[PDB]
Every structure is written in structure tokens, then in C-alpha cells.
Amino acid sequence: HKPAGQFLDAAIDLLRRVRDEEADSIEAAGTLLADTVQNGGRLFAFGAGHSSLAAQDVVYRAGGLALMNLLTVPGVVGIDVMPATLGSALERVDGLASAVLDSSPLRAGDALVIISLSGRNALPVEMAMHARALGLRVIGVTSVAYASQTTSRHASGTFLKDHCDIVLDSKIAVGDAELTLDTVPAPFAPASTVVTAALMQAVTATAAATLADRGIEPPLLRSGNVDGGHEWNARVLEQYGERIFYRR
Ligand SMILES: O=C(O)[C@H](O)[C@@H](O)[C@H](O)[C@H](O)COP(=O)(O)O
Secondary structure, eight states, rough: OOOOHHHHHHHHHHHHHHHHHHHHHHHHHHHHHHHHTTOOOOOEEEOOOOHHHHHHTTSSSSBTTTEEEOOOOTTTTTSSSSSHHHHHHTTOTTTTTHHHHHHOOOOOOOEEEEEOOOOOOOHHHHHHHHHHTTTTOOOOOOOTTHHHOOOOTTTSSOGGGGOOOOEEOOOOTTTTTOOEEEEEEEEEOOOOOHHHHHHHHHHHHHHHHHHHHHTOOOOOOOOSSSHHHHHHHHHHHHTTTTGOOSOO
């Protein structure tokens, strides 16, 4: 009955829904990442604001693939921007996504994951449209419910899900808040980062296992906070440096 238990039970139920409903899509996404690695392509992940947190969770990560890179749009990487409200305004700016993609090392055949719960703003929609125009394969992590219950804020009238090769449904109901209290007018307690981080790890774990099953040793990193982790990782980062853009 207490709020903590209600929230955690809501988050568990959402993870169960992802496990039971998105198993085949997670497999397809992990397979696309493994194909891209095998074929010599690069891997990138993007999200704006709090959707950036799931993208970051798979980059330079203990237990994660060394080959996953972050596509950084300045001002929308997490909520670090001053003022934080500028992050929200930048999600509406047409042309930011193309500036960032065109400057990046992404090329035809690469894979880009785009995390956007709503999928409705100009920046993630444009990011997907322009990435596909550049020949990238695009995986979206998005709550498809928003596409029927909200209006697109992109000029095209379309949502992120309309421009993805693979769509992973992150299930969160409109409002991104799992609890209500009779005395309290706004809902509270968002689970979207819990779910998207979990979805992202399921995808990259699938990619790692798929590489392994093909006789390809997955380039996995170890935690730098267990003795010996940084030495292990140094080997891996050097080995795959050509497709890694967060170090040299
Ligand atoms: O207001 C909210 O819903 C979040 O606090 C906000 O930071 C969100 O994470 C970004 O606006 C990106 O939203 P999308 O994930 O829908 O792209």
C-alpha cells in the first residue's frame, strides 16, 4: 500500500510486459546489431533528455559492448544543460538532428538506436527520417500508445515509429507517471527510464549472445570498479578502436 511498493510493483509489471510482448522484437533488434558488427558497420544510440539515459546506459558500460557509441546532440544529453528548460526547447528545433548526423561518422549500413518515449517531437522524428535517408538502419524504442493518443509535433505529422526498421514498444502509458494520490492533482513516479534501460540492455545482451553463437567473440567491457577491469578494457578498446568514437 505504501508508495514505494506500488511504484516498484508497477515497474515490475512493465518489465514483465516487455519480456512477454517484445521478445521477438528484442531478438530482431539484437540480431540487427550483431549483423552490423559482423558486416563492419558502426553502432550508435541516441535519446533526448531523460531518454538519453537509456542510450548512455549501453555506452562504455560494464558488461556492455565496447562498439556501442553515443550520438551526442549538444544540450539534450541528459538534463545537464543550463537552463534545463532549454533541453525541452531544443527537442523542437528542426535541423539539429541533420547537423549532428551529418557531422558524425555514421555512414550507410550503420545502426542507430533512437529512444523517444513519445516519438512526437521534431528532433527524434527528424533524426530517424534523416538517418534512413543516409542509409542507416534505425531501431526505435518508443511507447507506441503515444502515436494514437497525441498529435505529432513534427511538420510531417508522423511519429518516430513511422521511420524505424525495428520498433521496440516501451509500453508506458501517456503521461509517464505510474501513481496517483487523491489529494494530489498531478500523477507521479515515472518508470520510463527503468523500462528503457532494461529494454536497451536486453537488446545489447541479445546482440552479444548472437555474435557468440556465430563464433565471434563479443567485445565486452568489464567494470572499472572491480580490480583489473581497466586493464581488461584497455585491451578491448585498442582492439576495436577503429569503430569506437569515445576514445582514441
Ligand atoms: O517531460 C518529460 O517527459 C521528461 O521529463 C523529459 O525530460 C523527456 O525525457 C524528454 O522531453 C524526451 O522525451 P521523449 O522521450 O518523449 O523523446
